[PDB]
Amino acid sequence: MIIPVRCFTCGKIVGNKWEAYLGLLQAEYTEGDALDALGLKRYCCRRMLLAHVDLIEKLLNYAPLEK
Amino acid sequence: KHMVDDKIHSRARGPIQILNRQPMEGRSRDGGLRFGEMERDCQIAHGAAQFLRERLFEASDP
Amino acid sequence: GEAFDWLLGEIESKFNQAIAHPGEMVGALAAQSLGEPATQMTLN
Amino acid sequence: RHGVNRQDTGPLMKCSFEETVDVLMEAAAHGESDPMKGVSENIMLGQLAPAGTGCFDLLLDAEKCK
Amino acid sequence: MNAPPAFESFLLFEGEKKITINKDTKVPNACLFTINKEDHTLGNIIKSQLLKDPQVLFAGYKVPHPLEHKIIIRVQTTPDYSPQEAFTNAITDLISELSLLEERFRVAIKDKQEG
Amino acid sequence: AGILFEDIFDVKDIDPEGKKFDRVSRLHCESESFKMDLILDVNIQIYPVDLGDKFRLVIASTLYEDGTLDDGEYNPTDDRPSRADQFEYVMYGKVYRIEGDETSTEAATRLSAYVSYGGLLMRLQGDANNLHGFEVDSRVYLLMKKLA
Amino acid sequence: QANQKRITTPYMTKYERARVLGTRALQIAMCAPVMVELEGETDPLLIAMKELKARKIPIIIRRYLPDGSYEDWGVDELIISD
Amino acid sequence: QSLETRAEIQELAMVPRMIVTPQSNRPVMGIVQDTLTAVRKFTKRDVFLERGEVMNLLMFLSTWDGKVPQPAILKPRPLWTGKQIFSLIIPGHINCIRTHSTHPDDEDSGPYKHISPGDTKVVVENGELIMGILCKKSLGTSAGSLVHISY
Amino acid sequence: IQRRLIKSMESVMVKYDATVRNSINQVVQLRYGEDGLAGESVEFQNLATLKPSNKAFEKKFRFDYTNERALRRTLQEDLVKDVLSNAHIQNELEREFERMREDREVLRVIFPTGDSKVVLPCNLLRMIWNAQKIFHINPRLPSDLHPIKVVE
Amino acid sequence: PYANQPTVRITELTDENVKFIIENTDLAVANSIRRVFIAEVPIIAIDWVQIDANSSVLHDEFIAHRLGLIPLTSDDIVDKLQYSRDCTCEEFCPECSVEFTLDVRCNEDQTRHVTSRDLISNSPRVIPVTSRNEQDDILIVKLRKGQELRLRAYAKKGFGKEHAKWNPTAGVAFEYDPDNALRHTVYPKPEEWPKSEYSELDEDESQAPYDPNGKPERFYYNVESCGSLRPETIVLSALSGLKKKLSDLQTQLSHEIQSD
Amino acid sequence: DNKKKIIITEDGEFKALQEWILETDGVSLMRVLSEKDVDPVRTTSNDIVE
RNA sequence: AUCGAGAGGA
Ligand SMILES: [Zn+2]
Numbered sequence A: 001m002i003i004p005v006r007c008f009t010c011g012k013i014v015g016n017k018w019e020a021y022l023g024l025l026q027a028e029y030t031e032g033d034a035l036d037a038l039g040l041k042r043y044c045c046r047r048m049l050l051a052h053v054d055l056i057e058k059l060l061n062y063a064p065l066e067k
Numbered sequence B: 001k002h003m004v005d006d007k008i009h010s011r012a013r014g015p016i017q018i019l020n021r022q023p024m025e026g027r028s029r030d031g032g033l034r035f036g037e038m039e040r041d042c043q044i045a046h047g048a049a050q051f052l053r054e055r056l057f058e059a060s061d062p
Numbered sequence C: 001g002e003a004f005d006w007l008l009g010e011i012e013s014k015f016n017q018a019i020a021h022p023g024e025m026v027g028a029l030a031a032q033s034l035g036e037p038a039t040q041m042t043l044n
Numbered sequence D: 001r002h003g004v005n006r007q008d009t010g011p012l013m014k015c016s017f018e019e020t021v022d023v024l025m026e027a028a029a030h031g032e033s034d035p036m037k038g039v040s041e042n043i044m045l046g047q048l049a050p051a052g053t054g055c056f057d058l059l060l061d062a063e064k065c066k
Numbered sequence E: 001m002n003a004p005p006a007f008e009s010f011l012l013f014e015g016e017k018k019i020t021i022n023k024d025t026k027v028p029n030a031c032l033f034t035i036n037k038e039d040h041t042l043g044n045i046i047k048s049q050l051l052k053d054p055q056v057l058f059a060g061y062k063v064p065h066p067l068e069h070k071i072i073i074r075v076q077t078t079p080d081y082s083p084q085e086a087f088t089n090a091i092t093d094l095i096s097e098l099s100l101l102e103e104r105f106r107v108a109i110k111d112k113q114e115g
Numbered sequence F: 001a002g003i004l005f006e007d008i009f010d011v012k013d014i015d016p017e018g019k020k021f022d023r024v025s026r027l028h029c030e031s032e033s034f035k036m037d038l039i040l041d042v043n044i045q046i047y048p049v050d051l052g053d054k055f056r057l058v059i060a061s062t063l064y065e066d067g068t069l070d071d072g073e074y075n076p077t078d079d080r081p082s083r084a085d086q087f088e089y090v091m092y093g094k095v096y097r098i099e100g101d102e103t104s105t106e107a108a109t110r111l112s113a114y115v116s117y118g119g120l121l122m123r124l125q126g127d128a129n130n131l132h133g134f135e136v137d138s139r140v141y142l143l144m145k146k147l148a
Numbered sequence G: 001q002a003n004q005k006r007i008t009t010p011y012m013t014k015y016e017r018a019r020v021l022g023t024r025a026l027q028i029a030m031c032a033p034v035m036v037e038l039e040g041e042t043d044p045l046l047i048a049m050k051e052l053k054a055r056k057i058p059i060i061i062r063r064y065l066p067d068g069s070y071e072d073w074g075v076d077e078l079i080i081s082d
Numbered sequence H: 001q002s003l004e005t006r007a008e009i010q011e012l013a014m015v016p017r018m019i020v021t022p023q024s025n026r027p028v029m030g031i032v033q034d035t036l037t038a039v040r041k042f043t044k045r046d047v048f049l050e051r052g053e054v055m056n057l058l059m060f061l062s063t064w065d066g067k068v069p070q071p072a073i074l075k076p077r078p079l080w081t082g083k084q085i086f087s088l089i090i091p092g093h094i095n096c097i098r099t100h101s102t103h104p105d106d107e108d109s110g111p112y113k114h115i116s117p118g119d120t121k122v123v124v125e126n127g128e129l130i131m132g133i134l135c136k137k138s139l140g141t142s143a144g145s146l147v148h149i150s151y
Numbered sequence I: 001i002q003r004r005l006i007k008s009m010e011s012v013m014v015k016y017d018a019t020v021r022n023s024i025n026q027v028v029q030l031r032y033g034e035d036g037l038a039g040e041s042v043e044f045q046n047l048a049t050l051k052p053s054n055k056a057f058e059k060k061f062r063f064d065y066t067n068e069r070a071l072r073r074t075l076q077e078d079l080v081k082d083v084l085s086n087a088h089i090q091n092e093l094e095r096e097f098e099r100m101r102e103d104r105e106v107l108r109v110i111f112p113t114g115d116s117k118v119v120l121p122c123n124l125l126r127m128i129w130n131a132q133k134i135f136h137i138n139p140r141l142p143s144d145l146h147p148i149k150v151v152e
Numbered sequence J: 001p002y003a004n005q006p007t008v009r010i011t012e013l014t015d016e017n018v019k020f021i022i023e024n025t026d027l028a029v030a031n032s033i034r035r036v037f038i039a040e041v042p043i044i045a046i047d048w049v050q051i052d053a054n055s056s057v058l059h060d061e062f063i064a065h066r067l068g069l070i071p072l073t074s075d076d077i078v079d080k081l082q083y084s085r086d087c088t089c090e091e092f093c094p095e096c097s098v099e100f101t102l103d104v105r106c107n108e109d110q111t112r113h114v115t116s117r118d119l120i121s122n123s124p125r126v127i128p129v130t131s132r133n134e135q136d137d138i139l140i141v142k143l144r145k146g147q148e149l150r151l152r153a154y155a156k157k158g159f160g161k162e163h164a165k166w167n168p169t170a171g172v173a174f175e176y177d178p179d180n181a182l183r184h185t186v187y188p189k190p191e192e193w194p195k196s197e198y199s200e201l202d203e204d205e206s207q208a209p210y211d212p213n214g215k216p217e218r219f220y221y222n223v224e225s226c227g228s229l230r231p232e233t234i235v236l237s238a239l240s241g242l243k244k245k246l247s248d249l250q251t252q253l254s255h256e257i258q259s260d
Numbered sequence K: 001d002n003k004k005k006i007i008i009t010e011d012g013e014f015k016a017l018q019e020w021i022l023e024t025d026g027v028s029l030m031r032v033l034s035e036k037d038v039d040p041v042r043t044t045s046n047d048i049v050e
Numbered sequence L: 001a002u003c004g005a006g007a008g009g010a
């Protein structure tokens, strides 16, 4: 639902790159160039950022249980 | 969906059915596994008469 | 001569080992031997 | 059933295969007696089938326990 | 349900020996070292160091089961030598090699950070 | 001495049927002193052999220069004088067949000894006079050296 | 039936071996005397197999014939193959 | 749940007693996927093992007498062959002739019948794989294979 | 089909008189498989006297006790002398060949198609090979086995 | 019959990775060093969580697992701290553990990113790597107005054999014989394969000529750090840990030999 | 060869004679056997009841 | 708990 912390394969930290990745994408980067800007050179970490579906943004459309 | 922890099951002298005093059916009922007709035929071919009697008499409903 | 005598003994022992054992459920065994291959041969 | 339950195999062996009720009812009407020779009959009664390890008896050897 | 704790690969159980030496009776001057709570990391280096000893006739190791957490190292030496002595010397040589490698890596790091 | 056969061979062909294995090559060779054909499987990866080469082949029952049997067990810590010191390529195998041109009544004029060096096969065929040292299910060594 | 002429096989069948070993192992487990010597064996099955190899199991196999008669064979009288 | 049933199963239904089936007088279990592809690759003619590799493999032989066999190649460098190690795996002194699946049909007629160019024509003698590439035909569930002859 | 077959044959068993009988004690086979042998131990073999011609059969199975030099190549000196001199032995070998020829005709009526593949208990060629390797038989030297010893 | 005399040559040293070469050592030593980089170099990581309040959309174990994988600077502290197995204290103490606290509440209308910057420690030396004084902070959870996350974690000493969260590496590139001279690989078509970065071959040549007398030497390493340790600290700690494994093994060996 | 006519030559070899055979779509084994030039010894059927 | 039904696994 949320960006993983580490790459499943190598263990590189990708948790701090989702927001930067999105900011680069709205900056008219291609996904490949964006992944290059964040330093994801192994295709495992590129897999992590490139195949992520941010479902938490949809789960935050529901009001919480307590106000 | 098929995780092993939802499938693993074992029995050793658990509950029994009311009508025929044989082990229950299912993991949820803590039931026993069915030693069916084909298992009976296999053990007849093996010639294992005491094991066959243990499974079909002594481990089910003495 | 030594090899032939050993061969004769070996033939005798293996033949006596090949004899069917009383108590073999050859009928159930034959039913299984004929039904197991039936599960592979084609329906059509 | 038309070939296997038409031989003199005993009502209990036949009821195990097919036509359980018809076979047992015929045996009742005719007073048939099952001699308990097959494996099905002994299996139903929880007795040692005369099959493999059950086709013989064991006796203790009093003269050899010494 | 059946998951062993992850520390069981590294930690010795109470009353369990780290290493056990058993004489191999098939051939003379051979021993089996059953080392508990180790794996290929030490087995491979100990074996390969033992292979550098010309007085070692056999040096092998195996992890008998991956789910279990022991290794067995079989060492056969020449009659004038001993498998226990060979194993000891192999460990000593590995320790000296690693000490030298560590000191040289420290020197290389110092050179790289300085210039 | 422990030598069953010795001669100089000349590689007349390599893999007539084509390369079957990458690191192994079959040499069809013929000697000059005895007129014996040789089919030999050699690990060309470690001991490459070119067409037209000339080598000395020595089938031996033992490696020790003095008559002394071998145990068939690997003893690298052996300081005895071994005749493998005088050769480049050495294999160790066993004779698994001895054919001949014998009839029901006549003995063999030509023999054909087959040896397997752990799967690398050799056939040394020629006059039966030169192959009396070969007996089936007997361990031998190759002892082969290249010469110019 | 004339014990001087027993028509059944002189070999112990696999089923006879199985049942004799099981029976004797149960007897040993129920504190019956052992007929062979024992180094350190405590499993009744191992003791029963040792007794069978030694030919010292005090059991008689009563083999029934289809006609209804029977033949009594001592476990030491039969040929143990396996 | 009893010593009698335990003895029954141990003497009648144990898997080693179940290797050959009476249905078709052949093995019912044989060597299977990875072990079969790998034994085919292993018994090829150009498989040469080094001393450390050989010792690694001998660690996994339960029925090993502890004697390293004399390598098939002594010089320029000691090398064992895959057939030389499978010979250690092969039990007893069994004798077996088979043919690898790629055995050409016109090879048993011409020359080279007993020295196969393709390393087909499996020959095991005295429990040593004298020659040939092992495969389904030699280690599978067919009749007359090494596993059958071993049993 | 499997269940039907099982229920039809389930109680057929090999009895201690070696007959195969059902629960009724009726006789289904006087010996199991017509040969009283279990199916695990039998294996494929070849009948060597089925397919060959009369000339080939004669040449391969008729012991030739007239060729002195061939016997000298196959047998040792005392065996050669006994085989060539004795006529009792020669008659024994002649009747051996006649018995094999009768067996040949029996096989020819049993297998009307020339299929020598048979399933029999003991793999005699493999046992012969085992004996050759166990005793280190040299195929090139004359043997010390008397053919009369083979017949007897 | 004696040890190797390995040499070292570091070809790149940054804060993110160390690229070096070890020569004149055995392949087993090189691979055991490589394995220890991954599995026996201790670091500090969160291994105990107590959720006092979690109104977020991720359940408690999700947050706990996520906190465990945040790297914590472990450089000089990991050698000083003890394993809780070895500590003579209760469940916790400052000698075997580091306390973290996290307390965030989304009151404002925009989504609140609970990141690793919100993990407040009692020890200034052991902090989240991203929080160390660029790269953004690791995201623990996004919160909506009215959602709240309050927890208390404890970080422990461990290595990658127990859990990958104690693995300090973000990839260990290991290579040897870049030109296939030992022929430990057999390319069916050697021309089809790209050249290693460490290759020394002209472009027409696909692989080096086969070396029959060759042995694996000159192993190339690129140890990338997840952040907890410096890459050179990972390598030094790996060598020290492997040496202490061997020393303990030798101690137990001596007790077994003398007891016989 | 399973349907060819396997004979034994005068020399003693098995020889497979290549001969015409008929396969019918129905069965009258009772009648077909009793026909001129039809082999009443090898002519058979797959209908076991007949 | 029973029974039935349905959905699935090999
Ligand atoms: Zn990655």
Ligand SMILES: [Zn+2]
Pocket: J084, J087, J088, J089, J090, J091, J092, J093, J094, J095, J096, J097
């Ligand atoms: Zn503490």
